[PDB]
Amino acid sequence: KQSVTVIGLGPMGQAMVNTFLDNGHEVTVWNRTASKAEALVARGAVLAPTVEDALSANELIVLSLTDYDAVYAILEPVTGSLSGKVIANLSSDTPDKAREAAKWAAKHGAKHLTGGVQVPPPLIGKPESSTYYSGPKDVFDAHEDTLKVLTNADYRGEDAGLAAMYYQAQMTIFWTTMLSYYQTLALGQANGVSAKELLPYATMMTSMMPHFLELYVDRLAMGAASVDHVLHTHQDAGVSTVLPAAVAEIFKAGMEKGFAENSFSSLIEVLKKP
Amino acid sequence: KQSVTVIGLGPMGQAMVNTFLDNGHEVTVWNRTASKAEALVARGAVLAPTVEDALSANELIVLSLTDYDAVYAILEPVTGSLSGKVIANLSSDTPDKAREAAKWAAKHGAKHLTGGVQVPPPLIGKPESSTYYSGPKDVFDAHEDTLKVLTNADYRGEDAGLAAMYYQAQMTIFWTTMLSYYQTLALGQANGVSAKELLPYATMMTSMMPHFLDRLAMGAASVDHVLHTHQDAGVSTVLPAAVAEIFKAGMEKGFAENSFSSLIEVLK
Numbered sequence: 067k068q069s070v071t072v073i074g075l076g077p078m079g080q081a082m083v084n085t086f087l088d089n090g091h092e093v094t095v096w097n098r099t100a101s102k103a104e105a106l107v108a109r110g111a112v113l114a115p116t117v118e119d120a121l122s123a124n125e126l127i128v129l130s131l132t133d134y135d136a137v138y139a140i141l142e143p144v145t146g147s148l149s150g151k152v153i154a155n156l157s158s159d160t161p162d163k164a165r166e167a168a169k170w171a172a173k174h175g176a177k178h179l180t181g182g183v184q185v186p187p188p189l190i191g192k193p194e195s196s197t198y199y200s201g202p203k204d205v206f207d208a209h210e211d212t213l214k215v216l217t218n219a220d221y222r223g224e225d226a227g228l229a230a231m232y233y234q235a236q237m238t239i240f241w242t243t244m245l246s247y248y249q250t251l252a253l254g255q256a257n258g259v260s261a262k263e264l265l266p267y268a269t270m271m272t273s274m275m276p277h278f279l280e281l282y283v284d285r286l287a288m289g290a291a292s293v294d295h296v297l298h299t300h301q302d303a304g305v306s307t308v309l310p311a312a313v314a315e316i317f318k319a320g321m322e323k324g325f326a327e328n329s330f331s332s333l334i335e336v337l338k339k340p
Numbered sequence: 341k342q343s344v345t346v347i348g349l350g351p352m353g354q355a356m357v358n359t360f361l362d363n364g365h366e367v368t369v370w371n372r373t374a375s376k377a378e379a380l381v382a383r384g385a386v387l388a389p390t391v392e393d394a395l396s397a398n399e400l401i402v403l404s405l406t407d408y409d410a411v412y413a414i415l416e417p418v419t420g421s422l423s424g425k426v427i428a429n430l431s432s433d434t435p436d437k438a439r440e441a442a443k444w445a446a447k448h449g450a451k452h453l454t455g456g457v458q459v460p461p462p463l464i465g466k467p468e469s470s471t472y473y474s475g476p477k478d479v480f481d482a483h484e485d486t487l488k489v490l491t492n493a494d495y496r497g498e499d500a501g502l503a504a505m506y507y508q509a510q511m512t513i514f515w516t517t518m519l520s521y522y523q524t525l526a527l528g529q530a531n532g533v534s535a536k537e538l539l540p541y542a543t544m545m546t547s548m549m550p551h552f553l554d555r556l557a558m559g560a561a562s563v564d565h566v567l568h569t570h571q572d573a574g575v576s577t578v579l580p581a582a583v584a585e586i587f588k589a590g591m592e593k594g595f596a597e598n599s600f601s602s603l604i605e606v607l608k
């Protein structure tokens with residue numbers, strides 16, 4: 067039912083428009099390169115000739131852009147068109163940028179919903195997909211039925227920075243795990259094991275943790291001893307030690323703070339302060 | 341059938357002996373702290389009075405000790421008793437320590453199999469369980485049927501360091517992921533989200549990667565947002581700074597337009 071505007075037609079934007087159209091919503095789109103909207107228009111989307119026209123077309127404006135700089139580049143020249151709009155900003159950036167953007171939007175008469183999309187574009191419109199949302203609750207409830215078409219809409223609270231925080235937490239785990247995976251493939255190669263032979267093992271190894279968390283001795287000292295073996299293994303192999311050294315540094319600080327006999331979770335205390 | 345010796349009766353050693361006994365094997369045991377064998381002896385294990393006696397009891401000697409320092413502490417005073425033995429060393433340590441130990445064992449007439457046990461003690465003897473093995477293939481094949489009583493036995497190659505490498509690879513991913521998890525809980529708290537409220541999300545966030553299993557420049561931009569988020573929050577930045585340093589080095593190598601996997605080159 068509710069028609070909607072989507073600005074930004076990279077891969078994420080494309081998926082969102084297609085999903086909106088699949089479900090019977092009229093969609094007005096805009097992008098810097100018009101040929102990216104061709105197929106979408108052929109499917110029933112309407113290409114606005116300017117950003118102003120995109121904004122005027124609908125109350126609900128969904129932004130799928132690379133970062134807040136891209137958002138401001140598009141919106142700063144058209145702030146006179148923002149009055150009475152609801153910006154569902156699904157672009158990645160920091161909690162503090164989200165907070166600033168919410169304030170700025172309100173200066174120009176618009177409401178701001180922060181969205182942190184948890185999935186890549188091919189999972190938009192699929193049942194198990196979800197997006198973190200934060201911002202004014204009354205505004206969220208008013209557009210929730212439209213936002214749910216893209217993903218489950220998981221409202222996390224009033225502050226504009228909250229959805230961004232959850233997203234950046236997700237990306238902390240994702241990128242760190244990704245590097246540890248690559249680190250292992252490097253270590254393998256330095257020991258004469260090809261990446262393709264080690265690949266299935268490294269892949270399975272990434273399931274240990276979610277399994278561990280689902281279920282769970284518990285002495286920091288034992289962890290520290292294992293981590294030291296990890297560090298020396300990478301040192302001995304001649305590969306980069308940036309990542310395992312950082313892990314060791316963190317365990318070291320816990321040990322130096324008298325946590326040897328405490329639970330692993332005491333590391334949360336270590337990480338709370340620089 | 342095959343009788344076996346187990347040296348080291350911490351929680352892992354205990355499980356191994358119990359599992360061997362459950363399956364009808366005669367087991368001879370030894371430990372630095374002799375009282376830890378009480379329960380096993382009460383089930384039929386034979387406590388050797390000396391390390392020499394433990395070694396002379398059997399061809400196959402399974403070691404479950406804290407590390408190689410412990411292994412040497414026990415075996416160095418009895419190097420004369422090692423001739424004709426097969427040491428299945430399941431003590432976790434580095435690949436280079438495993439290599440050095442294989443050479444040393446061979447100097448004293450013993451064969452050395454490196455074992456990297458992938459599971460905690462209660463999974464010993466159970467179907468889900470596996471152990472990485474490396475060392476001489478003929479020796480492995482000769483004792484594989486005994487070793488399979490403990491876990492599936494996954495032979496990875498001749499080099500003594502290999503099984504240890506696979507184990508340390510597993511622990512690289514485990515500990516690193518674990519710290520990223522704690523890092524998020526720290527970040528949550530600094531933003532007024534309690535660890536208990538964030539806990540189920542942080543847990544589901546650890547599945548992102550294996551599910552998920554592009555352009556380096558886009559990854560670098562996301563990682564910079566991660567770094568600044570933790571900086572802004574006032575929490576530790578040691579871990580996200582290290583992730584950023586790695587992405588930075590890739591960008592500085594001219595890999596912006598390459599796939600993420602180009603990071604393997606950066607890490608080599």
Ligand SMILES: NC(=O)C1=CN([C@@H]2O[C@H](COP(=O)(O)OP(=O)(O)OC[C@H]3O[C@@H](n4cnc5c(N)ncnc54)[C@H](OP(=O)(O)O)[C@@H]3O)[C@@H](O)[C@H]2O)C=CC1
Pocket residue numbers: 347348349350351352353371372373376404405406407409410411413414430431432433456457458459460461
């Ligand atoms: N527990 C687990 O979940 C897993 C463990 N591993 C690995 O298995 C091995 C054994 O672990 P686990 O049984 O859990 O307990 P530990 O890692 O604490 O090992 C304890 C054993 O090592 C002995 N030991 C320690 N230092 C010395 C020394 N200087 N001289 C002689 N003996 C020594 C202990 O003797 P005493 O009893 O007299 O102190 C005991 O028999 C470790 O290498 C570990 O990393 C691998 C996979 C899973």
